[PDB]
Amino acid sequence: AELSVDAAYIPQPVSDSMAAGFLTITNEGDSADELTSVTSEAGEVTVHETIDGTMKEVDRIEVPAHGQLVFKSGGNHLMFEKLKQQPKQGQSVAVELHFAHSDPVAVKLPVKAA
């Protein structure tokens, strides 16, 4: 339970099926962990890295000991796919973050202006 999240939101996408989510995970513990999956009732969620403006899926991204994992625009991000409609300002998406070596963490991601 030494993992916590802040800086969590979704910019309003120009899409009725896909969106990027940002958040920062902080690890106050002595041992590193991995984000192993993310679940949501809104759609399917995967972790992407950004590599010269291209996106790449990654299965098990590291959250370093006494460190933080930042998901932000043009870097690492959650990718929501198979959404049913365009997420809009006023709505929030809940996800659950699952870890290799720690309990799950629920996060709320409000949809913000793009």
Contacts with Cu ion by CB under 5 A lie at: 48, 55, 79
101 marked ligand binding residue: no
Beta carbon of residue 79, minimum distance to Cu ion (angstroms, whole number): 4
> Cα(89)–Cα(19) distance, rounded to whole angstroms?
13
From the number of C-beta atoms within 10 Å of its C-beta (0-12, 13-18, 19+), residue 11 rates as middle
Which residue number, 32 or 79, has a Cβ lying nearer to Cu ion?
A: 79
From the number of C-beta atoms within 10 Å of its C-beta (0-12, 13-18, 19+), residue 97 rates as buried
Which residue number, 79 or 105, has a Cβ lying nearer to Cu ion?
A: 79
Q: How far from chain centre, in Å, is Cα 76?
A: 8
55 marked ligand binding residue: yes
Which residue number, 1 or 51, has a Cβ lying nearer to Cu ion?
A: 51
Beta carbon of residue 73, minimum distance to Cu ion (angstroms, whole number): 11
Going by the annotation, the residues of the binding site for Cu(2+) are 48, 55, 77, 79
